[PDB]
């Protein structure tokens, strides 16, 4: 859902980060919070930014003035797991008189 009244402000809400570089793609439900400088080119980065060397994360400059595709959206994903564990998450029972 749209969160253009929560996660954006005039001047830019910079409280959210995302990854622009990763050596390989994520596995399903993988999280990657490393902070090493990504080497995009051939020049050795040696831990710092420079030509073709970038910090892998970027901020989202969220503003209420952005067009809809760039307004912030809050996303919640429901992953439902069937384990050997007892079921504990079940909807309401359809009881009657």
């Amino acid at each position, epitope marked *: 859902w749209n969160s253009n009244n929560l996660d954006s402000k005039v001047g830019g809400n*910079y409280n959210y980060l995302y990854r*622009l570089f990763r050596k390989s793609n994520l596995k399903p439900f993988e999280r990657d919070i490393s902070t090493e400088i990504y080497q*995009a*080119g051939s020049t050795p980065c040696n831990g710092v930014e420079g030509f*073709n060397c970038y910090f892998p994360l*970027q*901020s*989202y*400059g969220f503003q209420p003035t952005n067009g809809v595709g760039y307004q912030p959206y809050r996303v919640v994903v429901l992953s439902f797991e069937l384990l050997h564990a007892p079921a504990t998450v079940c909807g309401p029972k359809k009881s009657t008189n």
Partner: nanobody
Amino acid sequence: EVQLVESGGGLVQPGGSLRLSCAASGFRIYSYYSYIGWVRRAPGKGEELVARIYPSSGYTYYADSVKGRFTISADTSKNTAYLQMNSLRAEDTAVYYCARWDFAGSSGLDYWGQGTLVTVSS
């Protein structure tokens, strides 16, 4: 249809300042996540990264050699990036160039401005 178009070079005295301007033709800096930075090539030297601005994230970055003196900014209504170089010294004489870095894995600088000469001298 894309070109980086720049101007603003010339002669500045040491201790003074000079402002460069690079227009984004054919693309939009803020809305297409196309970032603009500046590069300089001093006589006798190769290319050295000076500054980068990312208006879509609201952040600026600088090279160690210019930190504390140079400020990079942009005006998204003019689709133009600027470099404000304060407290210039003779050692800062270089041809300055603007360059595009799209959001990105691999990356690099594909589009370059034509360059302009900034001369700092007494």
